[PDB]
Amino acid sequence: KRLFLPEWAPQEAVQLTWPHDRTDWAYMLDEVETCFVRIATAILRHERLIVVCPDRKRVFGLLPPELHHRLYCFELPSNDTWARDHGGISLLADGRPMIADFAFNGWGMKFAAHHDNLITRRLHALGLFAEGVTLDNRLAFVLEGGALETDGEGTLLTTDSCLFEPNRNAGLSRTAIIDTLKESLGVSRVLSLRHGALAGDDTDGHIDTLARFVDTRTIVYVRSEDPSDEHYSDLTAMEQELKELRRPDGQPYRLVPLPMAEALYDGADRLPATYANFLIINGAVLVPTYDSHLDAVALSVMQGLFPDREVIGIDCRPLVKQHGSLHCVTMQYPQGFIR
Amino acid sequence: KRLFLPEWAPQEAVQLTWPHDRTDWAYMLDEVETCFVRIATAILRHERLIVVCPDRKRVFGLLPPELHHRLYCFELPSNDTWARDHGGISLLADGRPMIADFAFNGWGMKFAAHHDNLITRRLHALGLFAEGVTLDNRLAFVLEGGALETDGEGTLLTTDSCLFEPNRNAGLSRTAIIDTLKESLGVSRVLSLRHGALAGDDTDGHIDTLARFVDTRTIVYVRSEDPSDEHYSDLTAMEQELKELRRPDGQPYRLVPLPMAEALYDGADRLPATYANFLIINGAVLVPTYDSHLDAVALSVMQGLFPDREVIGIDCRPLVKQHGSLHCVTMQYPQGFIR
């Protein structure tokens, strides 16, 4: 008996894997590290914060003073900052908090991850989770958070392009892969979209960057507008696929369109900027900004969907230059999961 | 009811994944490529050769035209050049020839492998294997031929340091992993050493670089005779483990020592040079050379064990620069498995 908690559920804290590169002394901070400080400072202001870094001294030294009591630093090696794809999945088993430690292999083996796929285990053995919280070893099944999206009702939303990656769980059949999700996460239905990809995306179309649940019966998604753009043809196909989706009660979902981020990139490589990659936390919502007249729209639409929490836009261009955004560098844990 | 075929068994050809500019060899392609051409040539002289490369044209150009009729070329994407660890494992399933595709993830996700872990499937699709050759999908189990060693008598020799690596099959239990080998390879017994390893080694102690089966009743192994070295302690202990081993018929194995490769390394990082890393092919034994007065003693002992094959020595210093020798870039296929 399992239940996959939704993001908006009351949180205990948010985990962040600080960039490993940073270790040298300097007068200022790079565009990317100031970004993590911004995120870490947004979270630390509403709830506790967990940090996997190369040395506590830098972190505590960068984040606001005497706000440190909400800061938990763990010195452990890492290969990247995508806590969302390698972090532990929080869920309830027979009413008790449990952590599913799925396997992360660099998004289909695209990048070394010998350190990231160890982070969750070290953190558990190190006593990071609440006393009693079990660690359900699922290292035999590759799966990343970004590809996971639920409503807390046993409904899972993902993408086939990801769930059926040749370097993920190709050794299992389609059904075996879906059943594992239903048994690991206790989900009753898996709604996997076959359309939807973002240029610059090395994750293989994570539902994490296209469509998301804001409540038990609402889904926000990136709707393209320019039919001459390279995304329009598939994004439109996706939107038509969501219209099909029925809510648990049998009724159609309330779909809220999100503006397509403007073509922003560095070099002949277009970046996957997306407003869908927002972080929901206690009393607030962190929404990526890319310095365009569009992110002001994404803030209004998100603010209306969350009149309860405060929408806080964080510039995530230094992150999109790394083919990823805000939500990709975070992993939340609900109340009673952390010590 | 399976059988894992030994290395000395008659072969149809050998596979090689040719290096390129899109690989780590980039800053020394000409140094390592002159090695491959040396190994390719030797193999193309006793049997056929399969090479996965970026463009057929270039490979044929470097190899002698007198041997183009045995040279096969498949243009497929690759990340590295270790056909030994990502290549397909040959075995007979009830007399019928079969190929097992085991997952390879960069030796524990230490390096990107999204391309290499696809060479086998891509090849089986391009019809590289003769009709009738089943392609057993074992992608659910991480395993590289470099950690495997058999006698063809149902015995397998490996190493705990590799078999129980945290990024290999941690999703499975110690006993579980061993039962997969017994099933996947049909081996009755799996003898795993808990001692032995090379300094600059990155494969986590592949048996491929320590003990080796030369015949159903003999084992060549790396011998350490200098207690002042950092390898003495570990190697001497391993020596005992091998001494404890016994053939399936009770009798103890014949243990012929091999000289610890002379200390050879570039910069400050010591290189994992090994004479145990040879390759047995129809009528010949390819052994690595490190321009040392020992690569003369090792060739001799090897010529003795195989008084029925030509003993060729290829300088594998460059190969070793990237931590790896001759045997690690090759993969033999029994006669009747290739078209």
Automatic annotation (TrEMBL), chains A, B:
The keyword Glycosyltransferase does not apply. Keywords: Hydrolase. Transmembrane segments: none annotated. Signal peptide: none annotated. GO terms for molecular function: agmatine deiminase activity; protein-arginine deiminase activity. One of its GO terms (biological process) is putrescine biosynthetic process. PANTHER family: AGMATINE DEIMINASE-RELATED. This is Agmatine deiminase.
